[PDB]
């Protein structure tokens, strides 16, 4: 069917760009570098519900994004997850972690309130990510 | 090099068996149905560090495991993640969620100390998972 980004994902993110398969979204919490891939395929709840070739494309994009974010943000560890307990539209979290970050070594989700990006922080991180995003096209 | 299961993973789990690529581990917490895939390749921290063909095999196994667990445990939603902030050996979590389960709708990690399976509970869940384990060969 006709893919439409879920309203909660739209509300919680800024759009960074588009890969071949996915919308590339910045989670609007500047506490951690946090990018979401949303495959533009209607009605998908789980990775396994994608056709095999689209699973493999998502993997290619996710692995390329993760490795690139690690270098770009000088991270200590990646966290990658598909959760979706309250948003049924499949989306894949990519979060750069640091031994010095506020949640370490636990998970980030629900640790503390989000801090929205300022205009200049949003533009800076979008710009920083464009080379990597172009790799995903 | 010579793969060796990380001591913390060994301590926290019961080994169900092996897939083509991985150790298939039961997380030793009966609070949620939770199985961990550990690729049997030394020195890997992140999915993207595997050779592409092992990344694709891990994906296949993860998707087969997840879809199978959903039907076997009558789940509402899967949660799949590679975190590894404490344990550097790549391992991929697969947790069956139900509406209203413990910690719902948040993620499970760090929300309760584990409750070990008793001998009899371990035998039950092992028997329940055996067909699906075999599908990962
Ligand atoms: Ca938005
Ligand atoms: Ca292919
Ligand atoms: Ca063990």
Secondary structure of A23-83 as H, E, C letters: EEEEECCCCCCEEEEEECCCCCCCHHHCCHHHHHHHHHHHHHHHHHHHHHCCCCEEEEEEC
- Distance (angstroms) between ligand 1 centre and the Cα of A10 equals 4
Could you give the CA distance from residue B76 to residue A92 in angstroms, rounded to a whole number? 18
Could you give the CA distance from residue B57 to residue A38 in angstroms, rounded to a whole number? 22
CA closest to B105 among chain A residues:
A85
Could you give the CA distance from residue B32 to residue B53 in angstroms, rounded to a whole number? 31
Residue B78 CA: distances (Å) to CA of A7, A84, B29, B73, B99? 21, 8, 17, 11, 11
Q: Which ligand is nearest to the CA of B16?
A: 3
B100 shares contact with chain A (CB less than 8 Å): no
Looking at domain A1-137, its CATH architecture is 2-Layer Sandwich (3.30)
Could you give the CA distance from residue B46 to residue A79 in angstroms, rounded to a whole number? 9
Decide if A16 contacts A126 (C-beta within 8 A).
yes
Give burial (CB, 10 Å; 0-12/13-18/19+) of A113.
Answer: exposed
Could you give the CA distance from residue B114 to residue B65 in angstroms, rounded to a whole number? 22
Could you give the CA distance from residue A68 to residue A123 in angstroms, rounded to a whole number? 18
**Main-chain phi, psi angles of B104, to 5 degrees:** -55, 140
DSSP B116: P
Beta bridge pairs of residue B92? B37
CA closest to B98 among chain A residues:
A85
- Where do we find the tokens 């083509």? B20
- Distance (angstroms) between ligand 1 centre and the Cα of A13 equals 5
- Choose among A46, A63, A77: nearest Cβ to B84: A77
- Choose among A63, A81, A104: nearest Cβ to B85: A104
Could you give the CA distance from residue B134 to residue B132 in angstroms, rounded to a whole number? 5
HSE of A60 in the Cβ direction (CA atoms, 13 Å)? 14
Say what the resolution is, in angstroms.
1.2
Decide if A43 contacts B45 (C-beta within 8 A).
no
């Amino acid at each position: 069917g006709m893919f439409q980004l879920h309203e909660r994902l739209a509300a919680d993110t800024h759009k960074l760009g588009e890969s071949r398969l996915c919308d590339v979204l910045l989670m609007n919490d500047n506490t951690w570098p946090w990018v979401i891939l949303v495959p533009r395929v209607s009605g998908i709840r789980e990775i396994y519900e994608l056709p095999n070739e689209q699973q493999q494309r998502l993997l290619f994009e996710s692995s390329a994004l993760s490795e690139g974010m690690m270098e770009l943000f000088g991270g200590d560890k990646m966290n990658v997850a598909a959760l979706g307990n309250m948003v049924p539209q499949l989306h894949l979290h990519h979060i750069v972690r640091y031994q010095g970050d506020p949640a370490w070594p636990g998970p980030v989700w629900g640790k503390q309130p989000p801090v929205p990006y300022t205009e200049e922080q949003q533009a800076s991180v979008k710009a920083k990510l464009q080379p990597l995003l172009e790799q995903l096209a």
